[PDB]
Design a protein around this ligand. Structure first.
Ligand SMILES: *Cc1cc2c(cc1C)N[C@]1([C@@H](CC=O)c3ccccc3)C(=O)NC(=O)N=C1N2C[C@H](O)[C@H](O)[C@H](O)COP(=O)(O)OP(=O)(O)OC[C@H]1O[C@@H](n2cnc3c(N)ncnc32)[C@H](O)[C@@H]1O
Ligand SMILES: *[C]C1=C([C])[C]=C2N=[C@]3([C]([C][C]=O)C4=[C][C]=[C][C]=[C]4)C(=O)[N]C(=O)N=C3N([C][C]([O])[C]([O])[C]([O])[C]OP([O])(=O)OP([O])(=O)O[C][C]3O[C](N4[C]=NC5=C4N=[C]N=C5[N])[C]([O])[C]3[O])C2=[C]1
Ligand SMILES: c1ccc2oc(-c3ncc[nH]3)cc2c1
Ligand SMILES: c1ccc2oc(-c3ncc[nH]3)cc2c1
Lengths: 499, 494
């Protein structure tokens, strides 16, 4: 019934919000739609897997908030296996390699590829993290899709193909579905193309021992009975002195303030009194989440390491159900596994199959990519299609189709009277990740603390000390990487000696 | 508590479905979220305007279902004023014209404009009304926005700007917001560019005497207390033998079947048990509605008629608040009024202003386009910003961003167990309009009748005899229009 702050959503964002509120002396309640906490993080435990992350999993350098929160809860990280070779599978053949990107040998193609990544970061540096619609060419970049941008930038099909796979993997959407401005913001606010895409030194470096689900669960442990499970929120009424929050099992909660810690578009599941202001009312119908099936295939041994493959595959081509994989072997060396994502339109297309038909297609793909008949011998399989989640809407996160971010972006975290907005989508650094979740949750909690007169305004946004355990190597370039011409820039140099 | 069919939504779609079911002898209940019926139609009455449509208003030849239902309810139409000359205002200057499209004089620009309209209709000829995702090129067209299509087709700035305004007017959305496939289908399923853009012999031919709101109000009168106002549906449970539907103020309704007659995205407001199938779960986050403010400025007389202007203005440019207007004068010649639409991003931009401020910007604009000082002396003003409606989401209708129609279009009208889908979005002819609302309400009502064993399968989709009152004339083209070359085709000929 009565408390200081109702937190809607028990994902990482709402749990981190609740925790900061609770540690500061406020009476908090978390109302969660599902019969579990964790949201888009979910750790399954059974005998056959021990544990496995079926939703968000990876943490890496620069994600300092989630590392600190997890560390304080008693959690530990281990490194994703990248000891052996990565594989870039393109046009029906596998090419082993090491480093941030597969090596390009054709010099034209090398210029084009180098120019593409460079330009992505170049554009991204024009986009303020906390205000992407403030980019000088915001309008122009928002009024085109990533497909149209790739068409302009890539003078080789090779670069276009690789870039398409990058977009699909980063935002589980098609290049034609997303705003170029948004997508360029999304990469920048994660530290750029190298940081977002890498294992060592990047987004995919680590996982938590025991699963990421422990983050939400351990905060629930601390909060005790303050976390109401199976309370989907249906109605928020701010016409009276205290905010009123009603659940689907007709329970009523009364609070000074509310934090909405749910993906933006799921705000539609809530009836508002009085109605949302116009801009938000429309924004939450315009912000879909991606489509992905996260699949884990278990084997007797991590046989791929014996062939000097670490288990990372970048797999191009329409016939390939999975376009990206990682080694998911437990740190102790057992429960050998390959994690792979079925992305965007393929998540849609292949959801029609049975679980056993999807397993079959994945083993056959891995057999071919790894040149290994053993991949045909799985011992177990787990999978999650995030598109069927009523209380997620998809994964990993919310994407912005063209024209949306500049028109409606401003309102994503604008308070509505006594409702404040958390959820990874409102973050300025690793939005879409567990990291963005902790940032948006703690920031929304702090907005309410300033509203109550408990902290000055300059404590609303707070920077984070760098993890001592997972430190960040800078993202550096080389001279030639910086100054090699693009393909048309070389065509321009050729025109000039010929004139 | 118990009945045969709960209909969610009392807009024209939900009312038309409930009326057909009740006329078959079924027990229906209509659950309506607002304190009023009509949805995206809304007729306001006061002494100053007598009555004024603030939502959907216009009807025309080929829209035989809405015309039929309205006739049966005792409603009559009158013709929108198109006697005098239309106006095209471009780079600060009015060009009066007669006929549907503004004439173009420069020969290249001419080839470019001609080609643009003709190409939109030839592309439409390959798009099935009932399944646009089966167009030969569905993926290719769905994977680009109308902006991109326009960058490709239009060789002149003139064509591109008129085409842009055309898109903004038809679907209240920017050219870069919307799928080319979806837009091309939207136009095709209204009978083509001419039919959709025309007043005489097109979609803006007519208004209802007394307001379109009467369509839903008069069906509510038939149904009496079967319609439950201020009952927003929150929860639908299909786990048991009877379907259970719960509303916000805790009422429970139990039925054999449900018709959802709300815009697709508004399905998000309802919690479902069991969850929706995946494709629907995701679809209904992918389909926003457009942005529009409908503004009606009142004047002492239809002074524009005196200068041989009919009141229709097509007004180019970023600076103009309103890009399109029609004469809103009552048939009697009184309550002189200009109706204009503030479209898409302008509706977002200009909503921050006060009502008086918007009035003043509209009057200065109309004074300039009509070239009349009398436009600066309004006697009254009414307006409606549909962007702000929790239970509409915008207007006129739902648009599809790039990639969505090919990927999720099929689910739009697919039954989910015992829930059938109505609403103008699920129509195959004049979807987006009151006409589609009717088609969709009746079809979804007839799917249930067939599920109950009351009618054969071939009676679910029914053709509609042409209205005697509003007969359609054929859309024609000329030899030159069919065969003049495009700009690049005139280049390939040089
Ligand atoms: C789904 C998913 C998510 C992520 C990954 C994979 C999958 C399959 N991968 C991640 C990413 C992110 C990439 O951009 C990644 C992918 C590939 C390579 C590297 C990294 C990770 O590996 N690492 C990572 O940091 N993040 C990953 N993904 C995203 C995270 O899972 C996600 O950002 C956070 O989980 C989001 O947290 P939060 O903002 O708190 O939001 P939730 O959706 O988790 O919580 C909402 C909460 O609200 C409840 N709810 C909904 N509606 C309600 C009503 N009406 N009333 C009451 N409660 C309500 C929900 O049940 C939920 O509990
Ligand atoms: C808004 C609007 C405006 C402003 C305008 C308009 N217009 C029109 C058109 C379109 C096109 O495209 C035009 C324009 C221009 C020129 C010409 C033309 C006209 O005029 N005409 C027609 O026809 N149309 C129109 N529009 C639109 C219309 O209106 C539509 O389509 C219709 O109306 C639709 O309907 P429906 O389908 O039925 O739907 P709605 O109405 O929306 O309804 C629904 C209902 O529901 C409810 N809800 C929600 N939710 C819920 C509910 N209930 C219960 N529960 C729940 N939860 C709501 O409230 C309603 O009522 C136009 C427009
Ligand atoms: C395009 C698409 C997918 C990709 O995955 C990587 C990667 N994985 C581990 C180090 N780099 C790089 C990359 C580039
Ligand atoms: C482009 C944009 C808007 C337009 O409105 C018309 C029109 N109105 C009445 C007859 N034709 C034609 C037209 C063309």
């Amino acid at each position: 019934n009565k408390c200081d702050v109702v937190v809607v959503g028990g994902g990482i964002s709402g749990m981190a919000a609740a925790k900061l509120l609770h540690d500061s002396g406020l009476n908090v309640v978390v109302l969660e739609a599902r019969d579990r906490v964790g949201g888009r993080t979910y750790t399954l435990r059974n005998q056959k897997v021990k544990y496995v992350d079926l939703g968000g999993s990876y943490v890496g350098p620069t994600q300092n908030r989630i590392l600190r929160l997890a560390k304080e809860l008693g959690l530990e990280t281990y490194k994703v296996n990248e000891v052996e070779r990565l594989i870039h599978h393109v046009k029906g053949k596998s090419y082993p390699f090491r480093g941030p990107f597969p090596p390009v040998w054709n010099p034209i193609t090398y210029l084009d590829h180098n120019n593409f990544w460079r330009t992505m970061d170049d554009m991204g540096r024009e986009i303020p993290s906390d205000a992407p619609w403030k980019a000088p060419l915001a309008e122009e970049w928002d009024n085109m899709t990533m497909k149209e941008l790739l068409d302009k930038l890539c003078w080789t099909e090779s670069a276009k193909q690789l870039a398409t796979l990058f977009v699909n993997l980063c935002v589980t959407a098609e290049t034609h579905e997303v705003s170029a401005l948004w997508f360029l913001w999304y990469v920048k606010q994660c530290g750029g193309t190298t940081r977002i895409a890498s294992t060592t030194n990047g987004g995919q470096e680590r996982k938590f021992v025991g699963g990421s689900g422990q983050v939400s669960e351990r905060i629930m442990d601390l909060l005790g009975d303050r976390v109401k499970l199976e309370r989907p929120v249906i109605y928020i009424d701010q016409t009276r002195e205290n905010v009123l929050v009603e659940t689907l099992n007709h329970e009523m909660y009364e609070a000074k303030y509310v934090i909405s810690a749910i993906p933006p578009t799921l705000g539609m599941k809530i009836h508002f009194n009085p109605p949302l202001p116009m801009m938000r009312n429309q924004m939450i119908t315009r912000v879909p989440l991606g489509s992905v099936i996260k699949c884990i295939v278990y084997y007797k041994e991590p046989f791929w390491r014996k062939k000097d493959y670490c288990g990372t595959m970048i797999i191009d081509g329409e016939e390939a159900p999975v376009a990206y994989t990682l080694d998911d072997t437990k740190p102790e060396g057992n429960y050998a596994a390959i994690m792979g994502f079925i992305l965007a339109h393929k998540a849609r297309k292949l959801a029609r199959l049975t679980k056993e038909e999807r397993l079959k297609k994945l083993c056959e793909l891995y057999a071919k990519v790894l040149g290994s008949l053993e991949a045909l011998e799985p011992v177990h399989y787990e999978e999650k299609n995030w598109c069927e989640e009523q209380y997620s809407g998809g994964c990993y996160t919310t994407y912005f189709p063209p024209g949306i971010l500049t028109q409606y972006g401003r309102v994503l975290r604008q308070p509505v009277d006594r409702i404040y907005f958390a959820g990874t989508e409102t973050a300025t650094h690793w939005s879409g990740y567990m990291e963005g979740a902790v940032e948006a949750g703690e920031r929304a909690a702090r907005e309410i603390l300033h509203a109550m007169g408990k902290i000055p305004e300059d404590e609303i946004w707070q920077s984070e000390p760098e993890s001592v355990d997972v430190p960040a190597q800078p993202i550096t370039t080389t001279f030639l990487e910086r100054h090699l011409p693009s393909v048309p820039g070389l065509l321009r140099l050729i025109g000039l000696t010929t004139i």
